[PDB]
Amino acid sequence: DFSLNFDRAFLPALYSLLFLLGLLGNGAVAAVLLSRRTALSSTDTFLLHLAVADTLLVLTLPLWAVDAAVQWVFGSGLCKVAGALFNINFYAGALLLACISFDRYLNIVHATQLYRRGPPARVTLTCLAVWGLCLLFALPDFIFLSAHHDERLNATHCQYNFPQVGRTALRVLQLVAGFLLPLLVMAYCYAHILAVLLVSRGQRRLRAMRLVVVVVVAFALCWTPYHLVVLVDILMDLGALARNCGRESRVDVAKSVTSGLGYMHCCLNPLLYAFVGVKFRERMWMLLLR
């Protein structure tokens, strides 16, 4: 019962603070961006969509906190709705970070082949593609997610009724599409950005390099701890390890803590991609004056 009590005494407050801070940060980013009368640049649009995704993901948190505390008490319909929202927004966030990195790489590395004389380079096509792909990936949540009434704990939670092979397949898709592909795209793009910036000439390059390194390190540190534990759980399930109660409890608590840390990244997104740029701070100041 150690894992259950730890969840009870630790998830409510953490998710409450995440909810407050995410609603106050990503909402502020969204408002600052939507306050713009003129056009919005490519990275501005991607940041807007990222802010919306993070807002929804944090919005669904308190229901999950209640789930951890006592039990699901909203029926299966809200189980399905919340799960779909969660997965859609998580995948959207990952792919939007990858798209932001690719846009930065295109603008800085291939700087002389994409030059434009101050037009709006509309990028809504990729945003629609991202959202459609996220819906396609979340379909299984729409299909399977239900609220089983456990006869072992007498509880009632939002869990999948997949077959075991299905659970492993969904875990593998999570790992591949949410972590590995975004991480590789980010790594390539930002390594090339650094390679270009080290051989550039200016005084603004230093902050750019530091920001790039911080962004990559933040993503890696925040998300690796959870995906590594997910890989350990896959290894256990496929027979690569021996099951026991103590290991089960360790895995459960580790998953809880690592997931908390991971959603802390969607909490921190405003502090890295939005508030550090002079453009966004100027827009924020203008808005607050208004």
Ligand X SMILES: NCCCC[C@H](NC(=O)[C@@H]1Cc2ccccc2CN1C(=O)CCC(=O)c1ccccc1)C(=O)NCC(c1ccccc1)c1ccccc1
- Output 102 or 142, the one with its CB closest to ligand X: 142
- Report helix, strand or coil for 156: strand
Q: How far apart are CA 76 and CA 78, in angstroms?
A: 6
Give me the least distance between CB of 153 and ligand X, in Å please: 10
Q: How far apart are CA 284 and CA 289, in angstroms?
A: 9
Residue 18 contacts ligand X per CB under 6 A: no
**Contact predicate 132/125, CB 8 Å:** no
Kindly tell me which residue out of 12, 102, 133, 252 binds ligand X, with binding defined by CB under 6 A.
252
| Footprint on residues 89-148 left by ligand X (CB under 6 A) | 90, 145
Task: Identify which range of 22-30, 39-47, 82-90, 205-213 contacts ligand X by CB under 6 A.
Answer: 82-90
Give me the least distance between CB of 252 and ligand X, in Å please: 6
Q: Which residues contact 52 (CB under 8 A, 6 or more apart)?
A: 26, 30
Q: How far apart are CA 42 and CA 87, in angstroms?
A: 25
Kindly tell me which residue out of 256, 269, 270, 274 binds ligand X, with binding defined by CB under 6 A.
256
Kindly tell me which residue out of 83, 93, 182, 270 binds ligand X, with binding defined by CB under 6 A.
83
Backbone angles phi, psi at 70, to 5 degrees: -120, -65
Residue 158 contacts ligand X per CB under 6 A: yes
Distance in Å from the first CA to the final CA of the chain: 54
Which ranges constitute the DSSP H helices of the chain? 2-34, 42-59, 61-69, 75-108, 124-144, 164-173, 181-198, 205-237, 245-269, 278-289
Task: Identify which range of 131-139, 212-220, 251-259, 271-279 contacts ligand X by CB under 6 A.
Answer: 251-259
Give me the least distance between CB of 151 and ligand X, in Å please: 16
How many residues belong to the site for ligand X (CB under 6 A)? 16
Task: Identify which range of 180-188, 237-245, 249-257, 281-289 contacts ligand X by CB under 6 A.
Answer: 249-257
Q: Which residues contact 175 (CB under 8 A, 6 or more apart)?
A: 227, 230, 231
Give me the least distance between CB of 256 and ligand X, in Å please: 5
Kindly tell me which residue out of 19, 46, 48, 86 binds ligand X, with binding defined by CB under 6 A.
86
Residue 233 contacts ligand X per CB under 6 A: no
Task: Identify which range of 41-49, 61-69, 105-113, 235-243 contacts ligand X by CB under 6 A.
Answer: 61-69
Instruction: Give me the residue whose beta carbon is nearest to ligand X.
Output: 83
> Helices 75-108 and 181-198 meet at what angle, rounded to 10?
20
| Footprint on residues 170-229 left by ligand X (CB under 6 A) | none
Residue whose entry in the numeric block shows the structure tokens 């999950």: 64
User: Two tokens at 287?
Assistant: 């808005």
Enumerate binding residues for ligand X (CB under 6 A).
7, 11, 64, 67-68, 83, 86-87, 90, 145, 157-158, 252, 255-256, 259
